[PDB]
Ligand binder design. Structure first.
Ligand SMILES: *[C@@H]1O[C@H](CO)[C@@H](O[C@@H]2O[C@H](CO)[C@@H](O)[C@H](O)[C@H]2NC(C)=O)[C@H](O)[C@H]1NC(C)=O
Ligand SMILES: *[C@@H]1O[C@H](CO)[C@@H](O[C@@H]2O[C@H](CO)[C@@H](O)[C@H](O)[C@H]2NC(C)=O)[C@H](O)[C@H]1NC(C)=O
Ligand SMILES: *[C@@H]1O[C@H](CO)[C@@H](O[C@@H]2O[C@H](CO)[C@@H](O)[C@H](O)[C@H]2NC(C)=O)[C@H](O)[C@H]1NC(C)=O
Ligand SMILES: *[C@@H]1O[C@H](CO)[C@@H](O)[C@H](O)[C@H]1NC(C)=O
Ligand SMILES: *[C@@H]1C[C@@H](O)[C@@H](O)[C@@H](CO)O1
Ligand SMILES: [Ca+2]
Length: 640
């Protein structure tokens, strides 16, 4: 009926901010080669204050060379004694975010680790100090090379923590002058981190935040008892239609109301990875076409604004938040300076399901809500009003509300699938840029000679690595192949996902069905070495081991194979070829209907080999194991 908002008996918890994740894995891959001005516009919609999503927090993967959901991300230490703080795109992204919002909060978290840290095992806790050394390197490099202060460091994404590791990490951070960096643990479930903190005083002192994933708006008693800040450090992960926007809206409010969580962080920041990779289009917005410039300011962007434009980390929740009589919820926050923000959500069940967890039915129906401002809020006479309706009307500023009759009270008619933000703040804005170009499929003729002497990013555009890591490579000692693309892992990472046994990078249009792929290849390992080119590759990311298609392999022992699968279990054709290590060969693979052919140096090696049809997927290149190999003069022409 009536809902009292009041600060006379004190405040609720401090609000820590809303954010999103770039990484786990390569979710920002296709954003880097957007042409201007579109790249900058996308970044504004994400990070520019009083504009779009206006995010408070950016969390990024600390790349570990392993597959981490939609690709691999490059590590700062591929090998022992290797350090490089200019690989990948997270450095660039953090700097772009910081340029727009100097007060943005930055977080790092590893999903995978380079294999050498395991000292013979696929386990990062074999040598605690070595693993902590590696992670602290990353934080120091952020500061020294990019002028970035990392605010929070995590442990091992959705994988076991080791209490001694966490203690060693704190000790090493302090030793390296990073006392200001805080620790969040364990980026998995509420247990066992929560009970561990109650039983171990030394662990309790070193953990600043309990970060739990997909908590379904609830926490657990042990986490409440800890007295630590509680964050949903990975949530959302739902297609960014109106359904996803509804999920985001509902959990933004109710994570605090139901679970005492004062930060929620969406996976992922922006969908800039091929949509047919796992969890396609599950970012706050969509930018999956750098070749066209087409992007989509999806509804979750405006859902974010309803909170982010009108709150900041350091504000406090009131004690007076809760559910509405007929469904939906309200939170309220102040800044201790006289401002007040009220965020109301009435998300229907059928239009707000997150993928994790699925909620049993709950009813939402038309209702009236009367709010009465008691305490210091009574004095307020005026409120700006922002309104969104999902299904569609986004972030529309309505007529100001006047509180004149001394009552300190007001009333609203609420329907379903609505958001209202009522705030004293006058700074709100629905940021706008002209529409970007229409969507267009990946170019049906595409080439890359990798001839770039000082590349802005460490890898050629559009190549999305799914196992292994591929990089621009310069070889001064060669003229024709001075600039190539090289696979650089020489051992399997400490994996997070189930990486393939062969390295692979995919590119192009998953819809492609008939296609001709060509590439110069160079095998660096004598006798045992092998490489391939491929087409119709149908799966990647967390499922890269499942990939089928047509794979044309050549080996340094003078053999070739054509397979139906990346794992090489199924043979379409096999035979001998004049192929050795350390020599450049040109491979061609043509696929049309039921039949494929392969060329070696422009000469037919096999033809009219029967393959599964229909079938469709990306073009790809790769190596037999985790081994050095180079590629040059890539080309594909295709039809869908
Ligand atoms: C966590 O939030 C819960 C609410 O979800 C708080 O628990 C109580 O909530 C009921 C209604 O659900 C209120 O009537 C009580 O006033 C709340 N208790 C107290 C002591 O305020 C709880 O406060 C929060 N836990 C904390 C802050 O540790
Ligand atoms: C609401 O919040 C705004 C934003 O901080 C407050 O305005 C600022 O007040 C500080 C002093 O506390 C000044 O140094 C800033 O220059 C002000 N900024 C702007 C944009 O005005 C404001 O005082 C708060 N209270 C009310 C009633 O608006
Ligand atoms: C890919 O190639 C196959 C084989 O050439 C095409 O399938 C043929 O299409 C023609 C004309 O549409 C038909 O007359 C044939 O009977 C089809 N053959 C088979 C085996 O189905 C297919 O249309 C091509 N697809 C694209 C997108 O180019
Ligand atoms: C939801 O609640 C309203 C009012 O109580 C009721 O009329 C309606 O039938 C309910 N819907 C369902 C599916 O129970
Ligand atoms: C959290 C980790 C991230 O990389 C994704 O795998 C996501 C999928 O829902 O879960
Ligand atoms: Ca070249």
């Amino acid at each position: 009926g009536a809902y009292v908002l009041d600060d006379s008996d004190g405040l609720g918890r401090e609000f820590d901010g809303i954010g999103a994740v770039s990484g786990g894995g390569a979710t920002s891959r296709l954003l880097v080669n957007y042409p201007e001005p579109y790249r900058s516009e996308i970044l504004d919609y994400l990070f520019k204050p009083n504009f779009g999503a206006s995010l408070h927090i950016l969390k990024v993967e600390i790349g570990g060379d392993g597959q981490t959901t939609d690709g691999t991300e490059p590590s700062h230490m591929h090998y022992e004694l290797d350090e490089n703080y200019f690989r990948g795109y997270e450095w660039w992204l953090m700097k772009e975010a910081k340029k727009r919002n100097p007060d943005i909060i930055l977080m790092g978290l590893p999903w995978s680790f380079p294999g050498w840290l395991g000292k013979g095992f696929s386990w990062p806790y074999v040598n605690l100090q070595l693993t902590a050394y590696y992670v602290v390197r990353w934080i120091l490099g952020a500061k020294h090379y990019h002028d970035l202060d990392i605010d929070y460091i995590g442990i091992w994404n959705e994988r076991p923590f080791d209490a001694n590791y966490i203690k060693e990490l704190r000790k090493m951070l302090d030793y390296q002058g990073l006392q200001r960096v805080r620790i969040i643990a364990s980026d998995n479930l509420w247990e066992p981190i929560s009970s561990s903190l109650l039983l171990d005083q030394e662990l309790w002192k070193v953990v600043d935040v309990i970060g739990a994933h997909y908590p379904g708006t609830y926490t657990v008693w042990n986490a409440k008892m800890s007295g630590k800040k509680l964050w949903s450090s990975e949530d959302f992960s739902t297609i960014n239609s109106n359904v996803g926007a509804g999920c985001w809206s509902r959990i933004l409010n109710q994570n605090y109301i139901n679970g005492n969580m004062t930060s929620t962080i969406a996976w992922n920041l922006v969908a800039s990875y091929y949509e047919e990779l796992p969890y396609g289009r599950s970012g706050l917005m969509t930018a999956q076409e750098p070749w066209s410039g087409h992007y989509v300011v999806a509804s979750p962007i405006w859902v974010s604004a309803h909170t982010t434009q009108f709150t900041q980390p350091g504000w406090y929740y009131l004690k007076t938040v809760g559910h509405l009589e007929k469904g939906g919820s309200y939170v309220a926050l102040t800044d201790g300076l006289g401002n007040l923000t009220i965020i109301i959500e009435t998300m229907s069940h059928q239009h707000s399901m997150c993928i994790r967890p699925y909620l049993p039915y709950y009813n939402v129906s038309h209702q009236l809500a009367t709010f009465t401002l008691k305490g210091s809020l009574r004095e307020i006479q005026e409120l700006q009003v922002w309104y969104t309706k999902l299904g569609r009307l986004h972030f529309k500023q309505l007529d100001t509300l006047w509180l004149l009759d001394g009552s300190g009270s007001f009333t609203l008619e609420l329907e379903e699938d609505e958001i209202f933000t009522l705030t004293t703040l006058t700074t709100g804005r629905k940021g706008s840029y002209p529409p970007p170009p229409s969507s267009k499929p990946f170019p049906t003729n595409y080439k890359d000679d990798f001839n770039v002497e000082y590349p802005l990013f460490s890898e050629a555009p559009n190549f999305a690595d799914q196992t292994g890591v591929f990089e621009y490579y310069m070889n001064n000692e060669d003229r024709e192949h001075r600039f190539t693309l090289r696979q650089v892992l020489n051992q399997r990472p400490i994996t997070w996902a189930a990486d393939a046994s062969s390295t692979i990078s995919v590119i192009g249009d998953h819809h492609w069905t008939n296609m001709t792929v060509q590439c110069d290849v160079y095998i660096e390992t004598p006798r045992s070495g092998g490489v391939f080119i491929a087409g119709r590759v149908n799966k990647g990311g967390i499922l890269i081991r499942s990939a089928t298609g047509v794979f044309f392999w050549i080996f340094a022992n003078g053999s070739y194979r054509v397979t139906a699968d990346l794992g090489g279990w199924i043979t379409y054709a096999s035979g001998h070829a004049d192929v050795t290590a350390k020599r450049w060969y040109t491979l061609t693979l043509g696929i049309k209907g039921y039949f494929a052919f392969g060329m070696l140096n422009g000469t037919i090696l096999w033809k009219n080999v029967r393959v599964k049809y229909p079938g469709h997927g990306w073009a790809a290149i790769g190596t037999h194991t985790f081994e050095f190999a180079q590629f040059d003069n890539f080309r594909v022409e295709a039809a869908r």
